[PDB]
């Protein structure tokens, strides 16, 4: 699956960086990339994808199960 986080406002870059550092610790094996205000996690299990969405529930996110 794929999770995409979209960060908003004047702090978006710093919040992305915070979330990115956190997720690199949760899943050192996850393929994590970012550009602009979007953070993308690939190679994550669909159930783990709903978990990290639920961990940062106020960050807008999408999940692609395919």
Numbering used by the authors: 0 to 65
Quote the paper:
The highly homologous integrins αvβ6 and αvβ8 bind to latent transforming growth factor-β1 and β3 (L-TGF-β1 and L-TGF-β3) leading to release of active TGF-β1 and -β31–3. Here, we describe a method for computationally designing hyperstable RGD-containing miniproteins that are highly selective for a single RGD integrin heterodimer and conformational state, and use this strategy to design inhibitors of αvβ6 and αvβ8 with high selectivity. We found small α/β ferredoxin folds were able to scaffold the RGDLXX(L/I) binding loop without clashing with the integrin while making additional contacts with both α and β subunit (α- and β-loop respectively).
Following two rounds of design and optimization (see supplementary info for details), two high affinity variants were selected for further characterization: B6B8_BP (av6_3_E13T) and B6_BP (av6_3_A39KG64R). Affinity maturation identified a substitution to a lysine (A39K) making a salt-bridge interaction with E316 of the β6 subunit while the LXX(L/I) motif remained fixed confirming the importance of this motif for selectivity towards αvβ6. B6_BP binds αvβ6 with a higher affinity than αvβ8 on the surface of K562 cells, with a Kd of 0.11 (±0.09) and 580 (±40) nM, respectively. B6B8_BP and B6_BP do not cross-react with RGD-binding integrins αvβ1, αvβ3, αvβ5, α5β1, α8β1, and αiibβ3 at concentrations up to 200 nM in cell surface binding experiments using K562 cells stably transfected with different RGD-binding integrins, corresponding to >1000-fold selectivity. AF680-B6_BP rapidly accumulated in the αvβ6 positive tumors and reached a high tumor-to-muscle fluorescence contrast ratio within 3 h post-injection.
